[PDB]
Amino acid sequence: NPAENFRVLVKQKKASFEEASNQLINHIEQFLDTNETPYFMKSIDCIRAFREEAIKFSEEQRFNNFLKALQEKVEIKQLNHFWEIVVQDGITLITKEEASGSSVTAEEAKKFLAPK
């Protein structure tokens, strides 16, 4: 339900809306004491919605650095439930693509998940 809330919030006043970013950050992170897979897939769906929202107009790099921050914050925490679920469900499109340039080299650097 809140996914639609911050989906329509960004397109109703045309602001940066750090409140929506904080809400989705709170939603995605809270999985240490909860093992509910439905919660995790709802969280990845809403963060993907915010990914495409950021892709839309001018804040691609904003969600790029947010995704990197999410990556190190899930990497520092060593738990049996980690970003593997994001990777297995992010197989379609999670890599950034702005224009001819760093997008392709990011594709090679991320597709294999490690430099080979």
Swiss-Prot record:
Subcellular location per the Swiss-Prot or TrEMBL entry: Nucleus; Nucleus, Nucleolus; Chromosome
PTM text: ADP-ribosylated by PARP3.
Domain of life where this protein originates: Eukaryota
Induction remarks: In osteoblasts, by FGF2.
Residue numbers bearing the N6-acetyllysine modification: 68, 73
Sequence position, cross-link Glycyl lysine isopeptide (Lys-Gly) (interchain with G-Cter in SUMO2): 77, 96
Subunit comment: Heterodimer composed of XRCC5/Ku80 and XRCC6/Ku70; heterodimerization stabilizes XRCC5 protein. Component of the core long-range non-homologous end joining (NHEJ) complex (also named DNA-PK complex) composed of PRKDC, LIG4, XRCC4, XRCC6/Ku70, XRCC5/Ku86 and NHEJ1/XLF. Additional component of the NHEJ complex includes PAXX. Following autophosphorylation, PRKDC dissociates from DNA, leading to formation of the short-range NHEJ complex, composed of LIG4, XRCC4, XRCC6/Ku70, XRCC5/Ku86 and NHEJ1/XLF.
Function: Single-stranded DNA-dependent ATP-dependent helicase that plays a key role in DNA non-homologous end joining (NHEJ) by recruiting DNA-PK to DNA. Required for double-strand break repair and V(D)J recombination. Also has a role in chromosome translocation. The DNA helicase II complex binds preferentially to fork-like ends of double-stranded DNA in a cell cycle-dependent manner. It works in the 3'-5' direction. During NHEJ, the XRCC5-XRRC6 dimer performs the recognition step: it recognizes and binds to the broken ends of the DNA and protects them from further resection.
Entry comment, domain topic: The EEXXXDDL motif is required for the interaction with catalytic subunit PRKDC and its recruitment to sites of DNA damage. The VWFA domain interacts with the KBM (Ku-binding motif) found in a number of DNA repair proteins.
Additional information: Individuals with systemic lupus erythematosus (SLE) and related disorders produce extremely large amounts of autoantibodies to XRCC6 and XRCC5.
Family: Belongs to the ku80 family.
Protein name: X-ray repair cross-complementing protein 5
Gene source species: Homo sapiens (Human)
Gene for this chain: XRCC5
